[PDB]
Design a protein around this ligand. Structure first.
Ligand SMILES: Nc1ncnc2c1ncn2[C@@H]1O[C@H](COP(=O)(O)OP(=O)(O)O)[C@@H](O)[C@H]1O
Ligand SMILES: Nc1ncnc2c1ncn2[C@@H]1O[C@H](COP(=O)(O)OP(=O)(O)O)[C@@H](O)[C@H]1O
Ligand SMILES: Nc1ncnc2c1ncn2[C@@H]1O[C@H](COP(=O)(O)OP(=O)(O)O)[C@@H](O)[C@H]1O
Ligand SMILES: Nc1ncnc2c1ncn2[C@@H]1O[C@H](COP(=O)(O)OP(=O)(O)O)[C@@H](O)[C@H]1O
Ligand SMILES: Nc1ncnc2c1ncn2[C@@H]1O[C@H](COP(=O)(O)OP(=O)(O)O)[C@@H](O)[C@H]1O
Ligand SMILES: Nc1ncnc2c1ncn2[C@@H]1O[C@H](COP(=O)(O)OP(=O)(O)O)[C@@H](O)[C@H]1O
Ligand SMILES: [Ca+2]
Ligand SMILES: [Ca+2]
Ligand SMILES: [Ca+2]
Ligand SMILES: [Ca+2]
Ligand SMILES: [Ca+2]
Ligand SMILES: [Ca+2]
Ligand SMILES: [Ca+2]
Ligand SMILES: [Ca+2]
Ligand SMILES: [Ca+2]
Ligand SMILES: [Ca+2]
Lengths: 151, 151, 151, 151, 151, 151
């Protein structure tokens, strides 16, 4: 049921504070399927383009510097409403406003170090996925539990 | 304290995806007392009797058929306001509306495969408990942590 | 694969200390298939027969009296070499000799309060299974992960 | 970053039910820094002063008597907005109103046995910290993750 | 202390049974640093070369077919004795012989489906890493906890 | 039962890497009773007194210096054979020799940064308990699970 996808990245602090496994586990246990996984050092050009809608924000320059200061984990997840639900799972932009149970709510404190980010919408998702992944990187397969996750 | 009881069932998908232990731990750690526990394949009759209020629903048959497609874990839990809080712990009928931290919110995606279900009123609870369990299958015992869970 | 089965029981102390979910989780994560599951208070007759081989031990009377003092969770698990491996998973008879990582090693201390028990041979398992369960109580189904657990 | 501090105490029932490690783990994983930690049996005088603001509640006598019936784990945690967020992490006063994902929501049921407590304002936190700890008991150090938690 | 590396791959069953997060978490919590992470569909040529030392084994053809039947997660970890210790963490080749606590011991049953594999030695490790990763894929950075993991 | 006690300390690296909760949970879930708990920075004198038997060791100074470099969590735990089993739970002096499932085995790598330590004999235990704790810092209480942990 629905092969909608979404882009999710584990920021540098998430990697530094050893939360990669915990984060990946949350999507797996949820029932979403992993299609892309990459550990890299995103270039500013890549970052600037990814965060184009915020190019004019006072903190923009800081966001790019930070996201570029260390390696990240780029990921792509598939599932019904994965974009909207993914957002719920990460929690509000500001950790202070993220509810316990969400990724940001349980593991971080400051907005400038909120360990993870994702896609805001479907359109944005496809656009972002293409920006980070080459079509030959999105592995396709069927989950042995697909029939128990979807009717 | 309180002797209120509720009926909770781990659905076929819940069993198939290996969430039995996880779900039971949720109730144990909360302080609720396990009263009845049985692994079974619910007969089509039992299920129709159980979901009666949904008989004339545009998907009743698909529901009854699915719940009959595999074994389930039928449970009875005891504790102050267990019925109401049990519902909270489960989350919303639609996993997309269930908050992270809840069972449906953390472990599933679609309403048709929402891994678990439970009584939504003290009246329905007793009714359902009478339908799925024989009185001798409800065990009476006192938790050693009794005085630390209740005033 | 393999349809070998084993009988495993979570003792009264295992239930009292809230370890039911944790224990079930370990057999589920291993790949074993849950076949039977019941919450009950074993009668002294049932217990004396189950432990007949120990009928002449100094501690036999104590074991029976104790195993009858509270409810136990009786289970039947299926899988390749489930009997021998289930034993490895439980740990040694004396928790003091059990290795960290095992059920007894991680969760208990004294031999007389060792939270769990299980068959030690295929022959005994089938005898015990027939002793604690009615044929209709053992459910047959196929794990959606079957092909990924067994070649 | 921020050096705001908060006082949090694991109540007698929290200790009795083996939740000390679990609770500490939640503040550590969030990014907060442990500043003070002591296991003690609070005297009635200390408790009456700590809860002075509730001195006129019908349940005040009961609270004091109860909070004095067993040992508690007193703690001081540091971090940006630790006071307000610590409160969010604990859940609501009445466990029934606490959301899954919160400490009270996940681990307890009744208001009189709600396993944990903490400051509700910066002013109160500093008063309580000074009340329960000696200055030399509050340790100053720098988290190796400092730069990845705070910008 | 020591930048020795090692190659570790999460076989297709490990991916299918949602153990990616759990596995990654075990290396992070251990203290090892992640340098490479890739989700792919290893070609037979790649596989045949990787398993050259077993080219003549009766089950070789089966191993290649299986490892190629689905996507895997290639990884590279750094740390003192990571190759030898990694081996310990995965557990024996045959799950039946893997101790509880190890990855294979806790999560799988059959040798033909032992969810994970790694490098047998340092030399082999470098060789294998080169075979799977392009020098421009092994991200290098320093852990904020490096001084607490090594003297 | 048994009133034997042992001294366990979470080292500076243990605190720095956020393993306090994890470690305490290990002892709580096993059934041991928490007797003393204090967060402190051990003075150089105390440490020399504690590691006396290692004074004339080629790395005594580096040890004493390190243990003084940051706060530690000093603990006293009670239970049948706690000293001996506590050592088992910790693992081997060298993490590379510690089996998965143990604390050192699961969470650290080098002997110089082995996150935890504890008494290795009943004699040393009492000696060390007298060195780190004031008699009033050892709390006496009875676990509600007392009868389910010990015969
Ligand atoms: N007010 C802010 N101050 C600093 N950084 C911010 C602020 N708002 C957003 N950011 C940063 O920009 C990232 C992208 O913003 P946005 O996409 O709007 O939120 P989200 O990542 O939660 O979807 C955030 O994850 C955060 O790191
Ligand atoms: N719109 C729907 N589409 C498919 N299945 C549904 C739908 N609504 C409800 N169901 C199924 O019927 C079950 C019973 O519904 P109901 O009792 O009303 O909600 P709940 O089980 O959450 O209390 C649900 O758990 C779900 O499996
Ligand atoms: N020395 C003993 N003292 C008390 N109880 C014992 C003793 N030895 C064995 N028992 C009890 O008898 C049970 C059955 O023994 P056995 O089946 O031989 O070991 P296991 O339970 O590990 O399969 C044990 O689980 C334990 O509860
Ligand atoms: N109605 C009540 N009955 C019994 N105890 C209560 C009641 N209301 C509050 N308490 C107790 O008083 C404590 C202190 O109250 P308060 O500080 O206002 O809430 P909180 O503990 O959530 O900060 C609560 O944690 C609870 O143990
Ligand atoms: N006897 C066997 N039968 C089937 N498959 C085997 C056998 N021995 C090894 N294999 C497979 O080949 C893989 C590589 O073997 P090897 O590298 O020797 O062991 P390990 O992966 O544990 O290092 C194993 O992980 C397993 O999948
Ligand atoms: N060879 C070594 N090199 C460095 N530090 C060591 C060495 N041997 C021991 N240590 C340190 O000294 C501590 C005390 O040693 P010891 O008490 O003999 O072992 P254990 O603490 O495991 O009981 C160890 O925990 C470790 O931190
Ligand atoms: Ca975004
Ligand atoms: Ca319902
Ligand atoms: Ca009836
Ligand atoms: Ca036995
Ligand atoms: Ca029979
Ligand atoms: Ca308060
Ligand atoms: Ca003071
Ligand atoms: Ca190998
Ligand atoms: Ca020692
Ligand atoms: Ca003294």
């Amino acid at each position: 049921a629905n092969c909608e996808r979404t882009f999710i990245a584990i920021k540098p602090d998430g990697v530094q504070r050893g939360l990669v496994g915990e984060i990946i586990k949350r999507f797996e246990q949820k029932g979403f399927r992993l299609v892309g996984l990459k550990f890299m050092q995103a270039s500013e050009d890549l970052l600037k383009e990814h965060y184009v809608d915020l190019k004019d924000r006072p903190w923009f320059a800081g966001l790019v510097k930070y996201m570029h200061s260390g390696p990240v984990v780029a990921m792509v997840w598939e599932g019904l409403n994965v974009v909207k639900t993914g957002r719920v799972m990460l929690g509000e932009t500001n950790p202070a406003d993220s509810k316990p149970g969400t990724i940001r709510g349980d593991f971080c404190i400051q907005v400038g170090r909120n360990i993870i980010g994702g896609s805001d919408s479907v359109e944005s998702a496809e656009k972002e996925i293409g920006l980070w992944f080459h079509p030959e990187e999105l592995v396709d397969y069927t989950s042995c539990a697909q029939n128990w996750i979807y009717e």
